Each structure stands twice: as C-alpha cells, then as structure tokens.
Design a protein around this ligand. Structure first.
Ligand code: GDP
Ligand code: MG
Length: 173
C-alpha cells in the first residue's frame, strides 16, 4: 500500500476528532477525547491504488510537533461558526504554511447539518451572524490556495468519505 500522513487542524470544537473517528470507525463517538490517541491508520482505495492514511489529530487551542513529513492537511472550520472561518487566514494558514510550505491543503467545512438547525440560527442571529454559506467556503479556498473545498457532517456522515478521498488524491500528487 501507498503510505501517506494526514494532519487535521482548526479551531477547538470545530469537529476535527469526530470527523477522524467517523471516517476511520464509521461510528460517531460516545466518549470524549481531545485528540485521537490510538489506532490512527485507515485504509482507502483511490483509482485502484491502495493507500494507508495515518490520521494525526491536533489540539487547536507543542502542536507543530505533528507537522514533519505531512503529505496532506485538512484545515477545518465549523459551518455554525463564522469566527472559526475567519481564523483560517488569520491563524491556521500562516501556521500550516510556515511548517508545511508546499503541502496540499483541503479546506473543510464541518457540521454541515447545523446550517439549517434552528437553535444554531437563533444563537448566531443574536450576534447578527448566520451559518457559513458554501460560497464563503469556496472563496476562502481560493484565498488560501487550497486544493479543494469540501463540506461534511460527521453526525450524518454526509460528505465524510468524499473529504478523505479528495485529501488522498491531493497527497498522491
Ligand atoms: N451537530 C454536529 N456536532 C458535531 C459534529 N462533529 C462533531 N460535533 C460536536 O461538536 C463537539 C466538538 O467535536 P470535536 O470533534 O471534539 O471537535 P474538535 O475539538 O475540533 O476535535 C462535540 O460536542 C461533538 O459532538 C457534526 O458533524 N455535527
Ligand atoms: Mg479534538
């Protein structure tokens, strides 16, 4: 199998750990771990090629120790948090491109299921905000030079497989 290292970064609580666990175990977690700490390698097949994908979780609140030899980056925000999106160019892209200057980035909008959630929309409206729109994610992907923009929901599994398929294709370049 082809072996590739993936590192996932982004604001705390934007769904990184749940995304990794739903992809690798096909089950939304019932217990809380800040970062995946065991069994970090998942299999995936892309265009006939077997690829082993090592999944490196991070705390988004030492962290640069995860960056060496990375083959692809998942840079995440949450669709229920316009603030987590604004931290993409202000915090995460400067850090990732410093330690991983030419590693491909997939920009990922997590928690897609909350875009139409009424509690989410009510909480954001009291701050004069609304959920991130897909056109905003695409614009940000252009801004930071990401290989692609993907939306997903770890809760519903919608788009999860596609995120990692796109990341693997980017890593194989
Ligand atoms: N509604 C919804 N909640 C999610 C989703 N993914 C993760 N979460 C919730 O969001 C919280 C933070 O998730 P976590 O993966 O630990 O975030 P991390 O700090 O970025 O690793 C937790 O309460 C999760 O249950 C999702 O896709 N949809
Ligand atoms: Mg986590």
């Amino acid at each position: 199998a082809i072996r590739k290292k993936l590192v996932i970064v982004g604001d705390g609580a934007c769904g990184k750990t749940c995304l990794l666990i739903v992809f690798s175990k096909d089950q939304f977690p019932e217990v809380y771990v800040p970062t995946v700490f065991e069994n970090c390698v998942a299999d995936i097949e892309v265009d006939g090629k077997q690829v082993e994908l090592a999944l490196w979780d991070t705390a988004g609140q030492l962290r640069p120790l995860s960056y060496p030899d990375t083959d692809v980056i998942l840079m995440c925000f949450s669709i229920d948090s316009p603030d987590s999106l604004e931290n993409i160019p202000e915090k995460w892209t400067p850090e990732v491109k410093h330690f991983c200057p030419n590693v491909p980035i997939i920009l990922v909008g997590n928690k897609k299921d909350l875009r139409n959630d009424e509690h989410t929309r009510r909480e954001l409206a009291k701050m004069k905000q609304e959920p991130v729109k897909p056109e905003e994610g695409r614009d940000m992907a252009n801004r930071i030079g990401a290989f692609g923009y993907m939306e997903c929901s770890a809760k519903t599994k919608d788009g999860v497989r596609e995120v990692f398929e796109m990341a693997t294709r980017a890593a194989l370049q």
